[PDB]
């Protein structure tokens, strides 16, 4: 909701576009725009 309100992802009546922001966040997660990795197990 905060991401939608900050980025203007609003439907009719100013309601946040939660599903569209979720799709954007997921796309950024897979396409290397958010840093994440699985650490290797310690021997």
């Amino acid at each position: 909701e905060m991401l939608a309100r900050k980025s203007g992802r609003l439907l009719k009546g100013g309601e946040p576009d939660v599903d569209g922001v979720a799709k954007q966040v997921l796309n950024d997660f897979m396409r290397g725009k958010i840093p994440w990795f699985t650490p290797a197990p310690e021997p």
Binding site: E1, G13, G14, E15, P16
Partner: protein
């Protein structure tokens, strides 16, 4: 200008009635009932900015103070000053009364 004027008389495009607005102004319990029939996360301005006379939500206090100077809000004020049509006035128009003993 009215958005989608072709289907503004449909039941799914219906707005709040003037007698309901009068009861909302007179009783906070009725307004509370109407507000619990809505979700606060979907309302403009998180539901914090509401005009009872227009029965309509706004994104900000600036927008609410803005519409108060407009003619639709003054039209609503004049209609409320005249008084909404009710079943009591409908009975009084034909001379009908209720006998409860």
């Amino acid at each position: 200008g009215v958005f989608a004027k072709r289907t503004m008389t449909k039941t799914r495009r219906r707005l709040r009635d003037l007698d309901q607005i009068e009861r909302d102004l007179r009783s906070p319990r009725h307004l509370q009932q109407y507000k619990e029939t809505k979700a606060a996360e979907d309302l403009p301005g998180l539901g914090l900015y509401y005009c009872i006379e227009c029965a309509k939500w706004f994104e900000s206090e600036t927008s609410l103070v803005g519409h108060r100077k407009g003619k639709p809000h003054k039209r609503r004020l004049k209609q409320l000053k005249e008084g909404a049509y009710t079943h009591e006035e409908a009975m009084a128009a034909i001379g009908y009364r209720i006998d409860n003993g």
